[PDB]
From a paper:
To obtain crystals of the PCP2-C3 construct with this substrate analog (hereafter referred to as Glystab) bound, we again used Sfp to attach PPant-Glystab to the PCP domain. The overall structure of the Glystab-loaded PCP2-C3 construct was highly similar to the holo-PCP2C3 construct (572/532 Å2 buried surface area (chain A/B) excluding PPant). In the Glystab structure, however, the density for the PPant extends through the acceptor channel of the C domain into the active site, as observed in the structure of the R2577G mutant. R2577 now forms weak interactions with two of the carbonyl oxygen atoms in the PPant arm (3.7 Å and 3.8 Å), possibly acting as a ratchet to hold the PPant arm (and substrate) in the correct position until after peptide bond formation has occurred. The PPant-Glystab extends completely into the active site, with the terminal amine of Glystab stabilized by hydrogen-bond interactions. Of particular interest, given the lack of clarity over the role of the active site histidine in the HHxxxDE motif, is its close proximity (3.6 Å) to the amino group of the Glystab moiety. An ordered water molecule also sits close (2.9 Å) to this amino group, where it likely forms a hydrogen bond. We also observed the close interaction of the atypical E residue in the HHxxxDE motif (which is typically a Gly in most C-domains) with the nitrogen atom of Glystab (2.6 Å). It is important to note that Glystab sits in a different position to the aminoacyl mimic in a previous model of a C domain bound to the acceptor substrate – in these structures the aminoacyl mimic does not enter into the active site as far as observed in our GlyStab-PCP2-C3 complex. With a functional condensation assay in hand, we first could verify that the stabilized Glystab acceptor substrate was a functional mimic of Gly in this C domain using intact protein MS together with PPant ejection (see Methods section).
Author numbering: 2481 to 2551, 2557 to 2999
The structure:
């Protein structure tokens, strides 16, 4: 759970009086000492509601270490002969592709504009190095009577897919097209690389497409970092000089599945967290009464669109200050605003919102390539018509309770709650909200001038997905990924504009009833 880390950083900043704090910043190096540690401890006790002492700050002086400390064995690397192991995340992502024709909805794109057209032969060499380094990028998933089995391809046997694509038409729609092309997870590695060139592009656009089975959005930064390292080494005619990974994805999965235990074991973390969710999701609505343009079709298509809401830097700043002043994360403010929006549209007082939560606290995977996002149902109650400030308190309590049981796999939660099912409706929630932060310092990759370009998706995973996305340097926008079966594009533009309006009012006056 990243939220503990963000709150610690928040406290460091207010106590040390700096706008300086990152996940790796040492409290004592930043000007903290034993006396000031009292104020960190006191504030964290009031915001997180757990026993913290100077003890923990001494042992774990960084926000990353402190957050992981006050919340299970460390990931251990297995032997060189170690067979691959699929995490329950990967098994669920494989299962999604069997239940539905997703049309590429579970591919994740990463697109980088480059001022120089890259060398396709060096690029292919660098991708091979990237795949050799990260086993998850060359792990196939084959079906069997049972379910899926991992198949780890040897580096020599991992046929990478790297190609140049000339752009006649515009590149942004071409990016969406390349992103949606399907992976056969049983025969192709879950990574595709395309270099878009053309008379209308200056340099090239480098497109990495992963299947989510091998990458979440936190994988963008190590993917670009490692690919940049391999590219520049191969351009110089040598293999990259790599510090080996502290852990492969299968190491993480084996450790996690061993600690999780079996659901029939009453002392297992799995059963204990499932029992929490069974009670926390009792009497859940099948779905929220949302204003759609078309009824829910019999078959889900995963066709989608993308509507953006721009946020003035003043608004971004006000939202950060509103979060800091109420002791919540920026995500929590966005989540509360989504709940108010659905509430005002007539969804009721019981608002379940799905949200991805990264399981990346262990230092061995904090910055590695893989899929670590569990999906949690964050159940927001809005009865009693409280203020926005009251709702921020409710949302913090709901989220911290939930984040303490973030390891129960979402598919096991569904199996435990047993909601009424329907293929055209995602179970337990149909609206997701998340907070995302794009990589910083990716401006000078591959010896050129580089910048990320966002890819307009033609797919959607739920009815609605709201993402508060920070670019790598202080900018932010809201992206609404909507199901095209249900919403016209103009309806989605209006929804995401209303979300911004709720945020404007909240920062202006959070003592206003919702
Ligand atoms: P933090 O690590 O920044 O600071 C810890 C301090 C406050 C320095 C703490 O360790 C401390 O005060 N140490 C000094 C303790 C000491 O000297 N005790 C002996 C006093 S002489 C009395 C003999 N009878």
């Amino acid at each position: 759970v990243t939220a503990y880390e963000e709150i610690v950083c928040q406290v460091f900043a207010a106590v040390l009086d700096r706008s300086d704090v990152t996940a790796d910043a040492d409290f004592f190096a930043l000007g903290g000492h034993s006396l000031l540690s009292l104020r960190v401890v006191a504030r964290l006790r009031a915001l997180l509601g757990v026993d913290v002492g100077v003890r923990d700050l001494f042992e774990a002086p960084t926000p990353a270490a402190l957050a992981a400390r006050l919340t299970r064995p460390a990931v251990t690397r297995r032997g060189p002969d170690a067979p691959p192991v699929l995490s329950h995340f990967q098994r669920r992502l494989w299962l999604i592709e069997q239940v539905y024709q997703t049309r590429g909805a579970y591919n994740v794109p990463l697109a980088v504009h480059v001022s120089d057209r890259l060398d396709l032969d060096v690029l292919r060499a660098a991708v091979r190095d990237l795949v050799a380094r990260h086993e998850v990028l060359r792990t196939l998933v084959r079906s069997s009577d049972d379910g899926p089995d991992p198949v780890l391809l040897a580096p020599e046997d991992a046929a990478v897919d790297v190609a140049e694509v000339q752009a006649a038409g515009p590149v942004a729609d071409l990016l969406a097209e390349l992103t949606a092309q399907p992976f056969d997870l049983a025969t192709q590695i879950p990574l595709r690389v395309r270099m878009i060139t053309g008379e209308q592009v200056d340099g090239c656009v480098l497109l990495l497409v992963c299947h989510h089975i091998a990458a979440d959005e936190w994988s963008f930064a190590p993917l670009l970092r490692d690919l940049d390292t391999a590219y520049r080494a191969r351009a110089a005619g040598r293999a990259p000089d790599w510090e080996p990974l502290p852990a492969q994805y299968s190491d993480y999965a084996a450790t996690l599945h061993d600690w999780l235990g079996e659901a029939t074991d009453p002392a297992s973390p799995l059963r204990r967290q499932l029992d929490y969710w069974q009670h926390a999701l009792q009497d859940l609505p099948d779905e929220l009464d949302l204003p759609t343009d078309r009824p829910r079709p019999a078959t889900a298509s995963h066709r989608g669109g993308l509507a953006r809401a721009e946020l003035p830097p003043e608004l971004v700043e006000a939202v950060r200050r509103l979060a800091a002043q109420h002791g919540v994360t920026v995500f929590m403010v966005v989540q509360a605003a989504v709940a108010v929006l659905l509430h005002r549209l007539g969804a009721g007082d019981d608002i379940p919102l799905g949200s991805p939560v990264a399981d990346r606290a262990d230092e061995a995977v904090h910055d590695t390539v893989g899929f670590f996002l569990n999906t949690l149902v964050l159940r927001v109650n809005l009865s009693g018509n409280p203020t926005f400030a009251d709702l921020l308190d409710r949302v913090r309590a709901v989220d911290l309770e939930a984040f303490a049981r973030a390891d129960a796999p979402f598919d096991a939660v569904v199996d435990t709650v047993k909601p009424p099912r329907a293929v055209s409706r995602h179970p337990l929630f149909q609206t997701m909200v998340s907070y995302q932060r794009r990589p910083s310092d990716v401006d000078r990759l591959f010896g050129a001038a580089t910048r990320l370009v966002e890819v307009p998706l033609d797919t959607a995973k739920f009815d609605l997905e709201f993402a508060f996305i920070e670019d790598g340097h202080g900018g932010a926008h809201i992206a609404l990924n909507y199901a095209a079966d249900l919403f016209d594009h103009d309806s989605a533009e209006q929804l995401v504009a209303r979300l911004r309006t709720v945020l404007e009012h909240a920062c202006a006056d959070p003592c206003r009833p919702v």
